[PDB]
Design an enzyme around this catalytic site. Sequence first.
Site, PDB file in Angstrom:
ATOM      1  N   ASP A   1      62.000  52.885  69.238  1.00 58.34           N
ATOM      2  CA  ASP A   1      61.297  51.699  70.002  1.00 58.34           C
ATOM      3  C   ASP A   1      61.825  51.708  71.430  1.00 58.34           C
ATOM      4  O   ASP A   1      61.146  50.763  71.904  1.00 58.34           O
ATOM      5  CB  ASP A   1      61.745  50.603  69.231  1.00 58.34           C
ATOM      6  CG  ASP A   1      61.329  50.237  67.669  1.00 58.34           C
ATOM      7  OD1 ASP A   1      60.447  51.238  67.384  1.00 58.34           O
ATOM      8  OD2 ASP A   1      61.789  49.237  67.117  1.00 58.34           O
TER       9      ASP A   1
ATOM     10  N   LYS B   1      63.352  55.937  63.431  1.00 58.49           N
ATOM     11  CA  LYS B   1      61.754  55.621  63.029  1.00 58.49           C
ATOM     12  C   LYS B   1      61.475  54.113  63.636  1.00 58.49           C
ATOM     13  O   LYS B   1      62.786  53.470  64.298  1.00 58.49           O
ATOM     14  CB  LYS B   1      61.552  55.376  61.525  1.00 58.49           C
ATOM     15  CG  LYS B   1      61.855  56.641  60.695  1.00 58.49           C
ATOM     16  CD  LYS B   1      61.209  56.467  59.341  1.00 58.49           C
ATOM     17  CE  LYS B   1      61.597  57.620  58.470  1.00 58.49           C
ATOM     18  NZ  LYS B   1      62.173  57.184  57.127  1.00 58.49           N
ATOM     19  N   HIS B   2      60.482  53.747  63.789  1.00 56.15           N
ATOM     20  CA  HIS B   2      60.218  52.401  64.227  1.00 56.15           C
ATOM     21  C   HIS B   2      60.664  51.193  63.469  1.00 56.15           C
ATOM     22  O   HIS B   2      60.680  51.329  62.339  1.00 56.15           O
ATOM     23  CB  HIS B   2      58.751  52.185  64.385  1.00 56.15           C
ATOM     24  CG  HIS B   2      58.129  53.050  65.560  1.00 56.15           C
ATOM     25  ND1 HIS B   2      58.687  52.756  66.980  1.00 56.15           N
ATOM     26  CD2 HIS B   2      57.301  54.230  65.851  1.00 56.15           C
ATOM     27  CE1 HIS B   2      57.866  53.830  67.773  1.00 56.15           C
ATOM     28  NE2 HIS B   2      57.398  54.384  67.019  1.00 56.15           N
ATOM     29  N   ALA B   3      61.289  50.111  63.920  1.00 56.70           N
ATOM     30  CA  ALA B   3      61.675  49.125  63.146  1.00 56.70           C
ATOM     31  C   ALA B   3      60.495  48.425  62.432  1.00 56.70           C
ATOM     32  O   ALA B   3      59.247  48.481  62.766  1.00 56.70           O
ATOM     33  CB  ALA B   3      62.354  48.072  64.001  1.00 56.70           C
TER      34      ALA B   3
END
Lengths: 527, 527
Positions: A178, A167-169
């Site tokens: 990312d 997932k995205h940070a």
Amino acid sequence: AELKMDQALLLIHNELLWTNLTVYWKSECCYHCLFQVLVNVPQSPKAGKPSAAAASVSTQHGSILQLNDTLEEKEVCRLEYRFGEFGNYSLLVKNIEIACDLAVNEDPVDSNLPVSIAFLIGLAVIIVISFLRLLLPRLRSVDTFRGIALILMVFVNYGGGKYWYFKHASWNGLTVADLVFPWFVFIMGSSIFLSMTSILQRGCSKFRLLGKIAWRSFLLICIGIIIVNPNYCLGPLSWDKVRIPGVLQRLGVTYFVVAVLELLFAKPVPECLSLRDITSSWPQWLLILVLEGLWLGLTFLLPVPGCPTGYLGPGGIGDFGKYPNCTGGAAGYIDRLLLGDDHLYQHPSSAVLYHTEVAYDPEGILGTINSIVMAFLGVQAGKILLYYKARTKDILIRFTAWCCILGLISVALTKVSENEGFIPVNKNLWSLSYVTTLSSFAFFILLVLYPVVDVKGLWTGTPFFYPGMNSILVYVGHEVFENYFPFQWKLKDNQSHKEHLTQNIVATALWVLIAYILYRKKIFWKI
Amino acid sequence: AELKMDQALLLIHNELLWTNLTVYWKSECCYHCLFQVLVNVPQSPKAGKPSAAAASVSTQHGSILQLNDTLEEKEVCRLEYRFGEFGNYSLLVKNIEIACDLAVNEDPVDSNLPVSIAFLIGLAVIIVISFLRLLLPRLRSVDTFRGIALILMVFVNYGGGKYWYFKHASWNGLTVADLVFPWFVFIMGSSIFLSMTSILQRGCSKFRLLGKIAWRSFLLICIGIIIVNPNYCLGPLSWDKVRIPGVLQRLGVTYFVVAVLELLFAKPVPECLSLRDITSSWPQWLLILVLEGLWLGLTFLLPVPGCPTGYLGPGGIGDFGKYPNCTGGAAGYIDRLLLGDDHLYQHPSSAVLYHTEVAYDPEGILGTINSIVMAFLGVQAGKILLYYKARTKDILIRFTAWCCILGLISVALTKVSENEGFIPVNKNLWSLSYVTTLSSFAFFILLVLYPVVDVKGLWTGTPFFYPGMNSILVYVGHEVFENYFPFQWKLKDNQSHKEHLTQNIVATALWVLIAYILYRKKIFWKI
Ligand SMILES: *[C@@H]1O[C@H](CO)[C@@H](O[C@@H]2O[C@H](CO)[C@@H](O)[C@H](O)[C@H]2NC(C)=O)[C@H](O)[C@H]1NC(C)=O
Ligand SMILES: *[C@@H]1O[C@H](CO)[C@@H](O[C@@H]2O[C@H](CO)[C@@H](O)[C@H](O)[C@H]2NC(C)=O)[C@H](O)[C@H]1NC(C)=O
Ligand SMILES: *[C@@H]1O[C@H](CO)[C@@H](O[C@@H]2O[C@H](CO)[C@@H](O)[C@H](O)[C@H]2NC(C)=O)[C@H](O)[C@H]1NC(C)=O
Ligand SMILES: *[C@@H]1O[C@H](CO)[C@@H](O[C@@H]2O[C@H](CO)[C@@H](O)[C@H](O)[C@H]2NC(C)=O)[C@H](O)[C@H]1NC(C)=O
Ligand SMILES: CC(C)CCC[C@@H](C)[C@H]1CC[C@H]2[C@@H]3CC=C4C[C@@H](O)CC[C@]4(C)[C@H]3CC[C@]12C
Ligand SMILES: CC(C)CCC[C@@H](C)[C@H]1CC[C@H]2[C@@H]3CC=C4C[C@@H](O)CC[C@]4(C)[C@H]3CC[C@]12C
Ligand SMILES: CCCCCCCCCCCCCCCC
Ligand SMILES: CCCCCCCCCCCCCCCC
Ligand SMILES: *[C@@H]1O[C@H](CO)[C@@H](O)[C@H](O)[C@H]1NC(C)=O
Ligand SMILES: *[C@@H]1O[C@H](CO)[C@@H](O)[C@H](O)[C@H]1NC(C)=O
Ligand SMILES: CCCCCCCCCCCCCC
Ligand SMILES: CCCCCCCCCCCCCC
Ligand SMILES: CCCCCCCCCCCCCC
Ligand SMILES: CCCCCCCCCCCCCC
Ligand SMILES: CCCCCCCCCCCCCC
Ligand SMILES: CCCCCCCCCCCCCC
Ligand SMILES: CCCCCCCCCCCCCC
Ligand SMILES: CCCCCCCCCCCCCC
Ligand SMILES: CCCCCCCCCCCCCC
Ligand SMILES: CCCCCCCCCCCCCC
Ligand SMILES: CCCCCCCCCCCCCC
Ligand SMILES: CCCCCCCCCCCCCC
Ligand SMILES: CCCCCCCCCCCC
Ligand SMILES: CCCCCCCCCCCC
Ligand SMILES: CCCCCCCCCCCC
Ligand SMILES: CCCCCCCCCCCC
Ligand SMILES: CCCCCCCC
Ligand SMILES: CCCCCCCC
Ligand SMILES: CCCCCCCC
Ligand SMILES: CCCCCCCC
Ligand SMILES: CCCCCCCC
Ligand SMILES: CCCCCCCC
Ligand SMILES: CCCCCCCC
Ligand SMILES: CCCCCCCC
């Protein structure tokens, strides 16, 4: 049990007679955050009968627990422990000095096992196929690079197995999610130079090329606004609920600026320690450095009302809850001033870890400067490829040099840490260190892919160049048909990493197969 | 006010002192239906103070009201009145004999005015364009016919202005919505003969053609099941919620049977009062008549448990509520036996007027026989076109004869009524009279379109042949992108016929424009 994915059960037994307890939880990865109430544990009514409370703790990162006397408001003890998924733990608080001891009732599961097995299966298939085969114009390395980015994008966008590292940070740092968007901007800059050089060498007019650039930019922006951004399952589109920024809008604006700049200062490629590919484009470099200075000045010197100047933080509970509505600083302020809250992204990635309530758009106005800088570094990669194509050694030397320079800039800016640099890496802000880090990654990827795929031909790029030749069709398709079978079906267990991962891998493989079928039928869509 | 679309307000004033009243409502278009409670009107507490009740009555058709004493269960008076949309009416019940008088407080609106104006605007544009122009292989009439059907389909599927005559009939009869699907089956049979005759004359093998037919049928069925049927806004697909029948599944099965029959008994077209196009295909006719006899025998003689034999009715409240779960008779019983309730259509068109609770699938198993009969009549139209192409007079005579024969069969079967014939017209059952009626319509449409468009060339079919040459792309596209802008946006008034009609007309025009753009770029998809 009622444990969701990535939760553990924590039973708290209070053997203290005259003190109520409040349990405060904090993630080790939430930077300068506030403690939040986990559960309240009443005092023990009688000796030998400890009061009991149960809570669920997230297991993605480490936990910090602080037990506080709810009347005296003072600390009795503190724990820093990394709970495991679906584990059953007990925390006993007892006199003799107050000592709290953590015990493991039921052991947790290995949550990362499905990823470990999936990589082993993929490696086994690779070796079996490569071993079996041993018994029996267009640059292919750029298509391979774009197809790798597309495969990662489809895996991540469909869920990534619900793993936090796919997932995205939340605010700062990097995950696998990312990486791919800056790579798309880089590759698109490279393609800008390759395509424009070929077209202008063939004898096309600059105004016809200008019209083509304008048409492509307009069409990218329109598709992004009308087809990709809205969630049409929620209802028919209304203007006050329309999100103006987005991925294809960013690509369209960046493409327009960089392509028009290249067109306006275009020069024929001439015919080895030389800096021709750099000095022949010094007006481009001067304008790019002026834009970068503008980004730095706006990010660090623009005053944002009711907010610190130069604020690089998520707001919410972060930075000790001092600036709850300051998500984005100058970038968020400029978005909210020129577009308004209702036209921005309503689910920023910082909402789950930092509990931000304001809308922040990752593809906002201010970060378009750094998007343009990323595309121009891609243009430099294409310039290296076309200026020194007669010499492989020159191309490899220049790719290595650019990778090292950009890596050193990233080291200086970030101080090799997630939150402590002058400009930490941040995809939401499209930071300068974000761009330099991913650009050095891209130059290294090209350093490896060019001789292997284009020069020596040891590898043909399979199966990565098939989607790399139909990127826009793959992107718009995976956005349109996300909820459809066979990409998405109902799972027997929605709290299982294994089932989510299997589904996402199968859907990604299906998109690769679709791209291969379109390649075999010679169906290619160029926006 | 709280009046929805197509509702009127009815205020009931009871001036009777010693009788409570129950108001029962019945639509004049609900055949042999039960009365339903509209509102209960208490007795007047004192003389000069009439008790008042308010209700909403549907205004699409005429209403029948029956006021009954709730204790004696006897009728006091009865009204048959056609209320107008958004009207405000009062019904006063008073002694002297009990007389109930209906008064109009606020006049209703003309609900059909937007349709009247839209037709006038369309006619004005037609005359202006035709007047302005005066100052300044592939059969085009079949493409024109298919494009007219496509334009009607897109208008109806998107809402039809929310007008009842642009929706499907509840059980029996015809609206504009009920015409286009049989026309598609007819045109597809005609195309079967044209395409197969050309292919076999060019020298292709029959087994290669058989493989092509099987591939097309399989692919149509798969697209229907996986892409068109499911509502993916509701959630990921689960097997127990999957609808197996559908429009493209019907077309795929019908195409397979009719195409294989034509292939197996294929004959070269030879080189005028003759019956060659009929007698050269007598095995086809014998098999078609056997299938029709099978449909009649199953529809009228198959015993359905807990249900009358030969039942042609909607169930629900219809037929005086005697057979509430008998929607479809033998057709529904065979669907529920071979597939089960959960794999059928869950929103049959009879639910709103007859209040049926069981699931009925309009594209079920039994009606595929009549779908095949419709396609074979289309095959006969293509046979006429190719056997007598050297003579326009022969083609027109045969089209007229077939139209008259099928019209006479329809007159005999229906007795020119909605519910009183031996086999009334019914799209849910895919009746024999449904097929003969729409086939005579199709033969008349071809009788008009062939000389105007193909022979004389007075008209080129614009703008109808543009979607007619991309029918499968238009159909799948309008299914996939129904909820998207610019086909669908949020309306200022959802209870307005004008706004819904404007939106649906604009969306239909947009699909015509898309088809024109694909035609100009020579992009044609044939399934
Ligand atoms: C739990 O209690 C401790 C007390 O030991 C709190 O820590 C103090 O918080 C105050 C703020 O009110 C600071 O000024 C002190 O410096 C902190 N330390 C000490 C030793 O007093 C802690 O804030 C409490 N936890 C929560 C969530 O409120
Ligand atoms: C976690 O483990 C504890 C054991 O330490 C479980 O507690 C038991 O619960 C059952 C029924 O709830 C009781 O019959 C036992 O007497 C309990 N044992 C002890 C030692 O307290 C607890 O149920 C577990 N939590 C789960 C499985 O969610
Ligand atoms: C309203 O009352 C009338 C009485 O006039 C009902 O009509 C009778 O209904 C019975 C059924 O119970 C029949 O056997 C009679 O033939 C009907 N007519 C007469 C004149 O008695 C009517 O059914 C009532 N309405 C409703 C909805 O129940
Ligand atoms: C339908 O028309 C009647 C008039 O016959 C409206 O009744 C009036 O209602 C207002 C406020 O509700 C009262 O002040 C008047 O005294 C009423 N007049 C009579 C004659 O009763 C009724 O409101 C209308 N219904 C609507 C507009 O929905
Ligand atoms: C061309 C490159 C190198 C520089 C471009 C940036 C310059 C022109 C601009 C961009 C934003 C500007 C800042 C924006 C607002 C303020 C706040 C005010 O109280 C003092 C000036 C100050 C602090 C400005 C200084 C100049 C500034 C940094
Ligand atoms: C070839 C054409 C003309 C005729 C085909 C239909 C014939 C073969 C079949 C189809 C369905 C059949 C009916 C189905 C079930 C029953 C109920 C039973 O209690 C008596 C026989 C009876 C009533 C059958 C009679 C024959 C029948 C009508
Ligand atoms: C990021 C993990 C997802 C894994 C995706 C695997 C894709 C493998 C390709 C499958 C289809 C190959 C078709 C091309 C054959 C030449
Ligand atoms: C059933 C009512 C809907 C009305 C649909 C009108 C469509 C008119 C066509 C508009 C676009 C024409 C493009 C082709 C120009 C040659
Ligand atoms: C704990 O909380 C309760 C209220 O729920 C309160 O009555 C009690 O006094 C508290 N314990 C102590 C030691 O004050
Ligand atoms: C009308 O209904 C009420 C109950 O709501 C009842 O008390 C009353 O008796 C009824 N009227 C007559 C005339 O019976
Ligand atoms: C063949 C004619 C060349 C003349 C100069 C062309 C310049 C093209 C770039 C213009 C930039 C305008 C920004 C929108
Ligand atoms: C001679 C052929 C000319 C082709 C079109 C050139 C003009 C297009 C200019 C678009 C500029 C857009 C700026 C926003
Ligand atoms: C010849 C076709 C011209 C099309 C012009 C479309 C408008 C230009 C919009 C592109 C600009 C987007 C970034 C500012
Ligand atoms: C024709 C030669 C002129 C040389 C001018 C100097 C060019 C300097 C380029 C600066 C590049 C900075 C980023 C690498
Ligand atoms: C979370 C911290 C991220 C920091 C990334 C910076 C690493 C420096 C890159 C060095 C060059 C690598 C060449 C491929
Ligand atoms: C990023 C992973 C690189 C290696 C992938 C290998 C896939 C299969 C290669 C075998 C085919 C070789 C064709 C020349
Ligand atoms: C060229 C060879 C012709 C031999 C006969 C071909 C018959 C084709 C139809 C077969 C029907 C099978 C039903 C699935
Ligand atoms: C000589 C070329 C042969 C091409 C394929 C023919 C065989 C296909 C038969 C499909 C039958 C399907 C019945 C369900
Ligand atoms: C040469 C390609 C053959 C494809 C065969 C596909 C299976 C046949 C299914 C079609 C039958 C549908 C109605 C019974
Ligand atoms: C070769 C001539 C044989 C003639 C056989 C009789 C054909 C009868 C066809 C029946 C058609 C019924 C529907 C019109
Ligand atoms: C609701 C009643 C429908 C009855 C339709 C039957 C009409 C008869 C058709 C006559 C021939 C028409 C030629 C176009
Ligand atoms: C169903 C309506 C038939 C007439 C539609 C007329 C549309 C415009 C015709 C003018 C163009 C003539 C081209 C030869
Ligand atoms: C450039 C694309 C802009 C699209 C604007 C969509 C507006 C939809 C809302 C209208 C209904 C309220
Ligand atoms: C339990 C449901 C399993 C679904 C398997 C995914 C389908 C992959 C192949 C799709 C071919 C169209
Ligand atoms: C011929 C096409 C059949 C498609 C079957 C779809 C099954 C989806 C359900 C699986 C998840 C429960
Ligand atoms: C109030 C919203 C009006 C929307 C108008 C429909 C758009 C029609 C043209 C679409 C061009 C892409
Ligand atoms: C993450 C690697 C997946 C391996 C399987 C891919 C082929 C379906
Ligand atoms: C070759 C022209 C240079 C123009 C100045 C550079 C900055 C725009
Ligand atoms: C004419 C040479 C000027 C050099 C400018 C360099 C800008 C980075
Ligand atoms: C495209 C501009 C829309 C912004 C509307 C709100 C401005 C604060
Ligand atoms: C129902 C006729 C509509 C007339 C307008 C069509 C052109 C947009
Ligand atoms: C020409 C062969 C005729 C076969 C009998 C007809 C019914 C299948
Ligand atoms: C050989 C002639 C037989 C005719 C059969 C007709 C079937 C409708
Ligand atoms: C395709 C057959 C599925 C039917 C399942 C239920 C049978 C009653």
